[PDB]
Design a protein around this ligand. Structure first.
Ligand code: HEM
Ligand code: HEM
Ligand SMILES: O=C(CCCCCn1ccnc1)N[C@@H](Cc1ccccc1)C(=O)O
Ligand SMILES: O=C(CCCCCn1ccnc1)N[C@@H](Cc1ccccc1)C(=O)O
Ligand SMILES: Cc1ccc(N)cc1
Ligand SMILES: Cc1ccc(N)cc1
Lengths: 451, 452
């Protein structure tokens, strides 16, 4: 009945616990000490972090809870607006955009994206095969190159040409700096000292809007016919109201999909490669499957579908390190959680996804081991035990896109290269609003299989 | 490219090769001579028996192959209908029943089953502790008593009371005879001779006995406690897709299905596991140490059973050497090539010979015939699709976890409470119905005098 709560800092309550460079890993440690639920207070805010499948399965009841905007998502509205990810379920523009955009992530849409996914995946393989003796690969950097280029090409027929750059594209430099300022506003008054920080925020948002303007103007002047994400954005009509998306919302969606479309996916690929080089039994099993399934120089759509074990590898990477580590919920009415924790209408909850995926009562005692075989049979996983893509009607719309891209890329990587952990890399998880291994490097020796 | 094929008997082709009391062991011997794949022809049917992980890993690709109904499952349809095991994947009642009944095998359902599993397991332990001097135990018979009562109690709140009987329950007398007639329809050189007419008459009477018990189980439930067991989901559970529940014809097929599938293979597993334990005293000791330190209470709990790691490895190593459901069948969904060597047309049939697959020397090494539970410490070291005792994919065994929990609980209590003796130096004799069991397996067990 009485809820635990971590240590407090006077009038700041628990907020200084978040004044760290790895807050999710710190929240995981508090969960280890306090258990399945604890209260977290900050100036002007109260929330509750859930860690057990038992309580999270109740919070995922959509008749009792709706998506809440975390403080990180509230601040992100300054550039993402009422796009799909940063809008409330009751805002007209969510359901409208959800109806207009779901078709662009169907199976027939996936088949159309596949060719352009291979285009970028081939650029990755060729970069690595063009390395000189004893040169190494910066894994998370190259994964971000691939995932950003893939969403740009597949979604908008725009080429970021990340593999022609040693520095990151100016879009993500401002993207990262804007998100870093969002991060800073969490652990922060508005004294004059922050005037430059507010000025820098406005410049970085303008840089992103400038790219969006180029993407839209290129399409209007294009003259060709495309059938991608941008096409449904401009021409698709909501079957309810009959209306298409108006002009502010399209640019909010473009910004939204550019960011949501690439960051979590590159982290997933980076984590997947880390666990593979750290677990030679798994890597051999995954490389055997890639070799026997990907028999052509260019993988087909059906061939990617057949990489069952690579998909199990990816799901086991999402279990240990879900790259979007949390989502928020609020109680729609007065209700009781777990029969012991009463909640009022509007009370907020945090789902701590990494901790949910370490519930020993669900996954057994060995939660920290990397075992893709946990996912051999999907029906064996209890309901709401595995939640890397959110929940319900507010779940990740790009889930199938992300899993197809990652399976294609990982499969080609395993077919064409042998990888070495030549530095005996010690896992260092960097935290923005998502999770990535920082400094992860490998050496790859080509198997000399042509494309 | 060219596929081997065993000796033929004129117009009967390979069918007389199956006219034996040990056909699976006969098919294993043919595999030893012919290798990883061979063609087997019968009047009106062609199939291919697979034996290597190399080819079976491709056959388990669900995008290219679907579950096929073998002739054994086709004939079993006369009493199992379109229940879960004998229905085609494309029959509406398979997916519907799969959606409704999968929750009754979840972790929360297992915890609810656990008390009634202990109920039957204690009756077993008490029977053995009540034996007189120099009396022995009939292992497969007592395992069949336990597994049948466990599925009866846990699934349907019906007590077969097998430990109060000398002769088998009337249900399984007709059940064993019905399954025996299915086996006979397989091996018959000519299928409708006059001699078999009574055999068909007896077949129908045995089906009526089984259906009559189903009627009693259903009427007993209709006359109101409040249960949440397998039968409860059968009667009230609704398919989230179609919104509808199962109709009354299909429920009766499911009850028959789960009564049979729920116990026969599990009793064979427990018998084989106990056989390998008495034949390998180092393993038996290692498993006995674990039972002693984990089962510290007079009644084992759900968590304690979860902790019997070595006993679970013991059960998996018994399933490797003698998988009690010895085969399953597949058909090609489209034209495809197997192993880059064997072209298959749409509809072509395959048989997975599970005991032979589990003896693939390229997978398990030099000691394939040795009983070493250690082989299962790490699943990541086992190549993909090398271990298939519960079938494959969406048609894999739905009762897998229930079977593994029951057997782990029972074996653990057996090892905690008794020391076992192979007083006859029993020579393994594998009986074949549609499943495999050691016939005539007997032991002596002397109690450790630990109260319950
Ligand atoms: C590894 C890859 C990914 C992960 C782990 C992931 C995770 C998530 C999660 C947890 C949410 C729900 C957040 C919340 O409830 O507040 C979400 C929503 C969303 N994701 Fe992803 N995502 C991934 C890839 C993608 C991709 C590739 C796209 C687009 C191309 C995308 C677009 C979106 C959008 C638009 C939403 C909001 C959907 C809505 O509420 O209508 N994501 N994602
Ligand atoms: C040692 C114990 C067991 C073994 C070796 C075993 C083996 C198998 C195998 C190999 C299959 C697939 C057959 C095929 O593909 O044609 C299967 C399916 C099935 N088993 Fe078991 N089983 C065991 C225990 C159980 C138990 C305890 C139950 C129920 C209480 C059960 C119920 C079923 C059902 C309903 C199916 C059909 C599933 C479907 O196709 O939807 N089995 N089993
Ligand atoms: O990380 C988060 C939520 C961020 C979710 C990730 C967003 N994403 C990205 C892609 N898919 C989802 N943290 C909390 C912590 C906090 C609590 C109380 C007071 C201040 C901050 C928050 O933002 O509210
Ligand atoms: O052993 C089998 C399959 C037996 C599977 C056991 C069924 N079970 C029980 C529990 N879970 C599955 N054999 C073939 C033999 C045959 C080949 C050609 C012509 C006729 C017969 C068949 O049935 O077709
Ligand atoms: C709005 C937004 C979308 C995705 C990420 N990773 C951060 C912020
Ligand atoms: C239908 C059927 C189910 C189980 C067994 N062992 C045989 C037949």
């Amino acid at each position: 009945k009485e809820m635990p709560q971590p240590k407090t800092f006077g009038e700041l309550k628990n907020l200084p616990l978040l004044n760290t460079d790895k807050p999710v890993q710190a929240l995981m440690k508090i969960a280890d000490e306090l258990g399945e639920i604890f209260k977290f207070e900050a100036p002007g805010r109260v929330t509750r972090y859930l860690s057990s499948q038992r309580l999270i399965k109740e919070a995922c009841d959509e008749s009792r809870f709706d998506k809440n905007l975390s403080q990180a998502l509230k601040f992100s509205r300054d550039f993402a607006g009422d796009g799909l990810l940063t809008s409330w379920t009751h805002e007209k523009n969510w359901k409208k955009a959800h109806n207009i955009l779901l078709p662009s992530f169907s199976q027939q849409a996936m088949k159309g994206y596949h060719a352009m996914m291979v285009d970028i995946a081939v650029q990755l393989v060729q970069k690595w095969e063009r390395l000189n003796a004893d040169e190494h690969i910066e894994v998370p950097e190259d994964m971000t190159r691939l995932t950003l280029d893939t969403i740009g090409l597949c979604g908008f027929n725009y080429r970021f040409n990340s593999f022609y750059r040693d520095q990151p594209h100016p879009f993500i430099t401002s993207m990262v700096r804007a998100l870093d300022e969002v991060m800073n506003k969490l652990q922060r008054p508005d004294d004059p000292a922050y005037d430059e920080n507010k000025r820098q925020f406005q410049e970085d948002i303008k840089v992103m809007n400038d790219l969006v303007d180029k993407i839209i103007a290129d399409r209007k002047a294009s003259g060709e016919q495309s059938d991608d994400l941008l096409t449904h954005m401009l021409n698709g009509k909501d079957p309810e109201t009959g209306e298409p998306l108006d002009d502010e919302n399209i640019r909010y969606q473009i910004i939204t999909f550019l960011i949501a479309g690439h960051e979590t996916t590159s982290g997933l690929l980076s984590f997947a490669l880390y666990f593979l080089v750290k677990n030679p039994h798994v890597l051999q099993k995954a490389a055997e499957e890639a070799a026997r399934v990907l028999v052509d120089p260019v993988p087909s759509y059906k061939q990617v579908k057949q990489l069952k074990y690579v998909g199990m590898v990816l799901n086991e990477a999402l279990r240990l390190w879900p790259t979007a580590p949390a989502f928020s919920l609020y109680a729609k009415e007065d209700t009781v959680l777990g029969g012991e924790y009463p909640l009022e209408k509007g009370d907020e909850l945090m789902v701590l996804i990494p901790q949910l995926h370490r519930d020993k009562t669900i996954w057994g005692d060995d939660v920290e081991e990397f075992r893709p075989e946990r996912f051999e049979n999907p029906s064996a996983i209890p309901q709401h035990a595995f939640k890397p893509f959110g929940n319900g009607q507010r779940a990740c719309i790009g889930q199938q896109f992300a899993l197809h891209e990652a399976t294609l890329v990982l499969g080609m990587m395993l077919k064409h290269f042998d990888f070495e952990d030549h530095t005996n890399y010690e896992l260092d998880i960097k935290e923005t609003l998502t999770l990535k291994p920082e400094g992860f490097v490998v050496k790859a020796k080509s198997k000399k299989i042509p494309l």
